Amino acid sequence: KISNIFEDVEFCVMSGTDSQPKPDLENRIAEFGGYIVQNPGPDTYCVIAGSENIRVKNIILSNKHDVVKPAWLLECFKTKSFVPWQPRFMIHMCPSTKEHFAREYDCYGDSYFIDTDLNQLKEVFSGIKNSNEQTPEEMASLIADLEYRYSWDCSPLSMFRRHTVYLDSYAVINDLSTKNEGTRLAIKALELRFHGAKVVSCLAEGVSHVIIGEDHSRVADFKAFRRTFKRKFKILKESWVTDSIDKCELQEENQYLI
Template sequence: WWECMTTTDIEDLRQKSGGKLAGSRFELGETEKPTKRKRKAGTQAAHPTLMEQFKGINASKIIKVSELLKGKEFCVINGPANYPKLTLETKVAELGGLIVQNPDLSTLCVIAEKSTVRVNNLIKNNRYDIVKADWLIKVVESMTWIPWSPADMIHVTPATKKVFQQGFDLYGDSYTLEATEEELQSVFHRMDVESVCQEAIAELEEEYFPDDSPYGLFRTCRIYIDNNLALGNPETHIPNSPLDLLQLELRFFGAGVSETLDTNVSHIIVHESDFSRVSTMKEIRSSRPKNKFHIVKENWVRDCMKEGSICPERTYEP
């Protein structure tokens, strides 16, 4: 109630405002100068930019140390942890090469360490050779130009594929260059070879090498070595068994060696110093209506090697 106005106050206010509901400070008799309202400084919106690891190098600040890559243009997509994109680009520029962020017709190749969406799109485009970053690292570290090989490539253009077909076989092994052990292992890993059973190998040997090679002597045999305390249980292997070395020799001469006494076993080799499991072997053999096996002493193997042919098993059974 202490803020109430009298009728005199209301009449005075009406006369000053001319009937308006609001008036300026001057109209209302206030003599203080109005203060200017400060505009609140707006925050500038951050514009999207390319992350540093995807930006190219500033070639003008790089000191050239060689002309090894002079006239060659590269587009580096990514690299391994120890040679990231910027490091690879710097090395290329130091060796006189050119770097672009988008390949074109003058680009020698695209360098990549791992597959990304961009790499997959370039593969679909099929216009550029895409080379593994390891190849460029080998060039940089050896300071020597190394021609491409199929093992260096992630993707090849039709033109490069024709060049490779003239100098390399289907699995990337060179017709003319000597291969290191590591390169041969790489070639073997690229081979998609179907497994061949022992019988098929034996037929091939019989057809093409009937008298030449003794290393397929036991090719038709599937052998169980009696070097376990419990039959067919490798976990009970007898330490330092005298048959262990014989097992390696049998493999060398083409035998298939089984760790269990399965139905495909044709021979069991026992050592003359331990016939404790022979009775159990004979019981198992008797219980089988077919696929029976021979039980022979270890000297049967030696005699077969001497004769160069499979000796009759009956005289060697314990």
């Protein structure tokens, strides 16, 4: 009527107490001539379920009717126009509705054609599982890979995913029994971890860049392990790793040599 587009579609308004009592919603749909039904008929492409019921459980069992959160229909009414089906009000899809959402959206709320913003990005990601289960180290590889191919490595805030950089928190290296306490060396290692660096406090072949500890006389052992381990480790003072995330500026990897 008022919104005659809301007519012509059967509406199982049996639980319309989504936000307001069901009779309010029934009156609203009538004002738009919507085809309200107490029980879902065949063309009930919207089963108004503002509250779970045993009958709602049955309609869930009956994979023929579209059990919905009526908040979407509230949005449609506020727009005075049918909002397209969005895969978050939907309780029990029809198989047609399942493939419908799988078509006009991906496996999440995001579509395949309609562009989304950071708000919709956060909404989808919350809809997506907690994807922190993936090793942040493998995520580092992903980042490194993506940050290079997408040129997202331009962000200095996470740059050492590319870098296999060592850091010295020990007075002498290749001796795990030694450690500097009450120092910034551990803080610098945390800076490395902020960029997703391969944070290592012992020199091996995998080491590529070496951040010196507070004592800069260790560069002798640094070069000794640069020659025992075939990689020429890039000698780095504190300022390198500090400005990597404090100043957010990568320092020269050769200016600190010895």
